[PDB]
């Protein structure tokens, strides 16, 4: 019995080793294709535009709230500008 | 029994070793490809953007009530 | 009878000793792998950002409350900023 | 009876001693590894962090009512 | 009869004397193990933080009350800060 | 009769004595590991810390 | 009898000892592939980032 289970364990590790290399190869090439500094840009610039879209108004707001269930300021800030 | 159990233990540990080795190598080579300072500079953004966002409400004065 | 219970007590303490050593070995190696100053940092920096967020607004607030069952100021402070 | 009871007392105290010795050594070597000043400086944080939090509401004036 | 009651009374006092010494031994050794000025600190510092918290806000409050069922100022002071 | 109870008293007091020393020893040794100068200002850290720390330190 | 349990203790502790080292090795190596530096800054990024990053990094 046990030696057959060892022979499958060598195969299980072989499949894991080779597929992990195949994915890493694809991932490295995909991150030489797009210049990797612009991956910082691709993640930041969407949400950073939703900053530039409020900073252009230069608001001077006043807040009135309940105290134990108060207004979520993030849902406020997006809500002026479309959350969905 | 104790011979088979020692052998099953060695089998299980040998799997745990080799799959951990693969998962480290994968993690290492992907993190090498991006550069840890690029991961850092993404991670810094989330907080800093939320700061600029809430600052942009321009809250001069406030009132809290029951 | 009693000597078998003593022989089980020697075995029980042997188990308790050896497991406690395995746990301490793992714990010391973990706390040498991460820098211990960065373990101080990891616990503070999460709730520190929830300070740094409100500190950016520099609020100037007026509070109206009930007396016998008043407004919790911690639920107020997180509530502007997402409690859940 | 009193011989067996003295022997059972001796057995129990011998267990209590040895499990306490293990639990001290465990506590000692973990607290050695973190450093008492690291435990201190985490414990100091909770209060000071809550102070900075509530200070940041900037409460100028207040009103209590029935 | 009554001689047996005297003999039990000696035994009752013997138990009371010994258990009282055993507890006092533990109590003295405990209060040498942790420094007794730290036992002064331990009881004060919990409530001290619930002072140091409100003292940081430096409130300038106004009160309105019913006269015959007035607002408890301790439940007010904790209530801003979590009573439960 | 009463000699048995007078002997059971020695046994009960022996159990009280020998367990009290184990707990005192444990308390002194834990206190000497986390020295009193950092048991002070651990009491203020509040429940969420105290639970997290006692889970963290076995 | 009890010799079998005295042997089972060696086996259970051997399993504890050998698995503990594999997880430490993995943790030390991942915590060197990225430093302890850059786990700071990652700790504040919040859940939407941390989930996205652990998906993004294999």
Curated annotation (Swiss-Prot), chains F, G:
Query: In its UniProt entry, what is this protein called?
Result: Major vault protein
Q: What is known of its domains?
A: MVP 3 mediates interaction with PTEN.
What gene name does this entry carry? MVP
Q: How does it assemble?
A: The vault ribonucleoprotein particle is a huge (400 A x 670 A) cage structure of 12.9 MDa. It consists of a dimer of half-vaults, with each half-vault comprising 39 identical major vault protein (MVP) chains, PARP4 and one or more vault RNAs (vRNAs). Interacts with TEP1. Interacts with PTEN and activated MAPK1. The phosphorylated protein interacts with the SH2 domains of PTPN11 and SRC. Interacts with APEX1. May interact with ZNF540.
Give the species: Homo sapiens
Post-translational modifications reported in the UniProt record: Phosphorylated on Tyr residues after EGF stimulation. Dephosphorylated by PTPN11.
Induction line: Up-regulated by IFNG/IFN-gamma.
Role according to the record: Required for normal vault structure. Vaults are multi-subunit structures that may act as scaffolds for proteins involved in signal transduction. Vaults may also play a role in nucleo-cytoplasmic transport. Down-regulates IFNG-mediated STAT1 signaling and subsequent activation of JAK. Down-regulates SRC activity and signaling through MAP kinases.
Q: Which residues of the full protein are shown?
A: 769 to 826 of 893
Per the UniProt record, the lineage of the source organism begins with: Eukaryota, Metazoa, Chordata, Craniata, Vertebrata
Tissue pattern of expression reads: Present in most normal tissues. Higher expression observed in epithelial cells with secretory and excretory functions, as well as in cells chronically exposed to xenobiotics, such as bronchial cells and cells lining the intestine. Overexpressed in many multidrug-resistant cancer cells.
Query: In which domain of life is the source organism classified?
Result: Eukaryota
Q: Where in the cell is it found?
A: Cytoplasm; Nucleus, Nuclear pore complex; Cytoplasm, Perinuclear region
């Amino acid at each position: 019995e046990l030696v057959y289970a060892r022979a499958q364990l060598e195969l299980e590790v072989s499949k894991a080793q080779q597929l992990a290399e195949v994915e890493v190869k694809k991932f490295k090439q995909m991150t030489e294709a797009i210049g990797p500094s612009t991956i910082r840009d691709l993640a930041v610039a969407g949400p950073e535009m939703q900053v530039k879209l409020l900073q252009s108004l230069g608001l001077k707001s006043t807040l009135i709230t309940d105290g134990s269930t108060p207004i979520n300021l993030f849902n406020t800030a997006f809500g002026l500008l479309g959350g969905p």
